[PDB]
Each structure stands twice: as C-alpha cells, then as structure tokens.
Amino acid sequence: PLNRRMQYSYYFPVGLFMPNPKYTTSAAIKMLDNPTQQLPVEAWIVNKNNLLLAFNLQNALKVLCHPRLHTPAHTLNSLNAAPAPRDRRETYSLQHRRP
Amino acid sequence: MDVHIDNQVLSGLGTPLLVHLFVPDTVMAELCPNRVPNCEGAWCQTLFSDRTGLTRVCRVFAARGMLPGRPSHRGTFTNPFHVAALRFYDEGGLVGELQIYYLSLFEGAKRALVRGIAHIFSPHALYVVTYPELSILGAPEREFRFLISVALRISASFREKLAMQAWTAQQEIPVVIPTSYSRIYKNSDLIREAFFTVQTRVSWESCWVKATISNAPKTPDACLWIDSHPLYEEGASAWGKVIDVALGTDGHCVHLATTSDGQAFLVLPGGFVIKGQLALTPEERGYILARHG
C-alpha cells in the first residue's frame, strides 16, 4: 500500500503568434524561411519512451468538429439568466429598417 | 403526414371535413419571437363572420419535414371569406394566434401533391397538400374594431375620473421622482402619448381581456393582470403579465394594470396613477367568452 499512484495535469500551447519586433537568442540555427512571415502551426511532444510525436490541427479536430462549439443557446441562457446584465444602452444597426 | 390519418381515425370521425395544411417556418416567424419550438399543442379553430360566430378547437401535430422532394418545402408540417386561428404554446412563456383564411385553400386544393398559397393577414406563402382520399371587406376587420371600441370607452372613462379630481393628478405608488426638474411640469407631453398609443394598440391578447375571463372569485380578486407597452413605439410590447412597483420606477413604460372586476389603472413614469372604469355589454362578454374560453 505504500505504492501510491500520483496523478498530475499537464498542458501545452500550440498555434501562437509572436508580435511585430521579432528577436532570436540562439546563434546556432540558420533557417531559410523569412522570419517576419513564419508562423507555427504544429507542436512536437516528447513521449514517455522518448519517441518524438506531433500534435497537429487534424488530430485536434475530433473536438473541433462538434456542435457544442457552434450553437449559442446555452451561452445565451447563462448570459441572460443573471440578475443584472450590462447597461442596456446599445442601439444602432441591430435590425434593418425597411423604407 | 401521419397526423392526417390519426385525425381521420379519431377526430375525423367526430368532425366532418378536414383541409390538411403545411406551414413554412418563415410563416412561423410572424408569431413567435426568437424561438423555434415544436408545435404539438397548436389549436386550430374556425371563425366565420357576418352570419353567426363559433369556434371548434383541435390539435394537429406538427413536425419538421424533409419528405418533400422539392427543396423549397423544407420545413414544418401540421361562404369563403372567414378565419381560422392556430393557438400555439409550449411549456414556457410563448402564446401565438395565427390566422389562415379561405380562397387560398379552395383554390389551392387543385391538382408529393403540393401547391403554394398566400396569407392575407400576415402575407407569406404557405403550402397546401391534397391527399388522394380527398361582402369581403368587413370580414377581417371586426376583431380589430370591437377591441378598439373598448379602448375608446376605457380612455373616455379615464377622462371622467380626471373630471372627478379637478383635472390634475394623484400618486398612488411610492416611486421617487427621478429628479426635481424645473423642466418636468410639461408632463402634458406624457399623457397625450398615452392616448396616442392606447388607441393605436389593439390585439386579441390584451390585459383586460384576460381580466374579463376569471376562473375563480377570490384569486383574481387577489391578482392583477398588467401590460406595459413602451412610449412612442420603440420596441415589442408585452401583454398578459401576471402579478402573483418597478414598472413605475423605470422610464419608457406607460404601465396599464387591470383587475378582474374591470377596474383599470394607467400608471405614468413617476408613479402617477389614474383609475379607469370598464363597460362590457353581455354581447362583449359572449364574444370574449367564446374566443378566450
């Protein structure tokens, strides 16, 4: 019973963008790509057995292609079922008015 | 489609003739605001003008349909010059009355057997199915004019009560005025707009109509039925709110509150209250008892 199982949570980001002044620290790497335009679209993860792995958008679509993203009805319900919403002063375009 | 044979084996053997009608969701956009709920409880009734008056209340179940091979009919399935009315509810707070008319139907029933027809009351195109087993101008107006006559009498009654009280005001609701303006005693601007909107507001589901129809003596004597339409027409007016006040506090609300005994109260912003009296002949009670109950 001393052989406990300790359970952790990890996280890692992917798909991020660097701002306009771009800088490098390391002098070793000489990539051909123009540094201004380049953008990361994928991640590399070290596995337990030290096998390099790729996290990609395509593998990420098994959550990205689901209706719970798109439908707003529960967001709308959790937003308006509160006592006080934001000050209701907003009036412009909201619906088209026929001439 | 199954609803037709369901009716013909249970309700079609209680009622002689049936016309099977399919309503697009665009036509449904007229009644219901900001909601697409399924239309099971929808009550269709007939109403015929200038001879005699009667309604027969029945549910035809509605389900959304892909079964038309034509792409255009994708959507929900459920003496000429007269009315039919569909009363639509759900478990929540949504009640609508839709008016189908004839001479779209008798012409429309002419040969998926389907044909497009037009609404007169709320103009859109509807689609009529025909199953293989199968004085103009005064006729719509009445439900308008009847109710609007009531409004005139109610408005005149307010004036009589003001004639009781030397033509100024009295405050019956504890609402602090928003500020002690000098430029507030032109509130003649407000009361005029009451007689603007009250006369230009007419709908079957007014507050006093539900006040006319009382199930009990005691609980309607203890209950108030209110409606607030905003000033000057910005937005959608609300009718038939129950009180099982804040309306006087916030602006843009000419509050109107009716008891079941016919007593009415016009409440202005600032808590000014004017009492009004109702006059209903037994003809008017018979009409409201027929349609509403």
């Binding site: 306009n20 209701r88 002063r89 | 959608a236 007016s237």
Partner: protein
C-alpha cells in the same frame, strides 16, 4: 469566438442578449488576431496554394 453577442434596449420587458455569427475569419477583432497575423496567414495561404 465564432459569434458576436450584444444587448438591445429593453421595452416593457428586460431585453435578452442576441448572437450573430461572424461568418469569416477576418471578422475576428484586432486584439484577438492582429493585422500581422492576417498578412502572415495570407502568405502561408499563398505558399499552400
């Protein structure tokens, strides 16, 4: 992310929020995705096509 939500003025009843879909990627706000992101995405699109 996908939609934009706003509040209309209340008339007789307290107004409820409303959502309208953004429909395009460029309808994102500039704090969330800047112009530099857009032109870099355009160049990546050009290399892909």
């Amino acid at each position: 992310p996908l939609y934009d939500i706003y509040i209309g003025r209340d008339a007789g009843e307290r107004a409820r929020h409303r959502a309208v879909h953004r429909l395009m990627v460029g309808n994102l706000p500039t704090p969330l995705a800047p112009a530099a992101f857009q032109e870099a995405r355009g160049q990546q699109f050009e290399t892909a096509t």
